[PDB]
Curated annotation (Swiss-Prot):
This is Pre-mRNA leakage protein 1. It comes from the Eukaryota. Residues 54-113 form the FHA domain. Belongs to the pre-mRNA retention and splicing (RES) complex composed of at least BUD13, IST3 and PML1. Required for efficient splicing and pre-mRNA nuclear retention. It comes from Saccharomyces cerevisiae (strain ATCC 204508 / S288c). GO terms for cellular component: cytoplasm; nucleus; RES complex; spliceosomal complex; U2 snRNP. It is found in: Cytoplasm; Nucleus.
Length: 145
């Protein structure tokens, strides 16, 4: 199971220490598009401000055991697929993705990332939960706002 770094911090706690009103702080979201009807707009938005880490993985609703905090209906995604991890990096809040040695891989902006390695996320970045785009019905967009 995933063990958080010593400098893990939630965006809420970080931004609160800095004494920031809504308009003066950065907030974080995972925007989920269901590809087949993305013209209708985002299917869901997951708030990423309250925890220092979020486990992404399979949750179909098709009995199913769910471990992930962010459950995506991807048939070929793993139950524990990847983690979104916030870190207070020498005083600067940064966010990383790490693939948890998933079966099919995690793609960041169409690049399969190396397994078990934090890779920095930037606003607008697109995650998909397989190295095979053909198999992905969803795309997950990391947003800073
Ligand atoms: Cl590599
Ligand atoms: Mg959930």
């Amino acid at each position: 199971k995933h063990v958080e770094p010593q400098d893990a911090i939630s965006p809420d706690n970080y931004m609160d220490m800095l004494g920031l009103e809504a308009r003066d702080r950065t907030m974080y979201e995972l925007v989920i598009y269901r590809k087949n009807d993305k013209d209708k707009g985002p299917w869901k938005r997951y708030d990423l401000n309250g925890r220092s880490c979020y486990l992404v993985g399979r949750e179909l609703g098709h009995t199913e055991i769910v471990v992930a905090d962010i459950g995506i209906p991807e048939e070929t995604s793993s139950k524990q697929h990847c983690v979104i991890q916030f870190r207070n990096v020498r005083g600067i809040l940064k966010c990383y993705v790490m693939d948890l040695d998933s079966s099919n891989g995690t793609c960041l902006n169409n690049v399969v990332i190396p397994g078990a390695r934090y890779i920095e996320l930037r606003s607008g970045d697109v995650l998909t939960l397989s190295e095979f785009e053909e198999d992905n019905d969803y795309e997950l967009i990391f947003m800073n706002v």
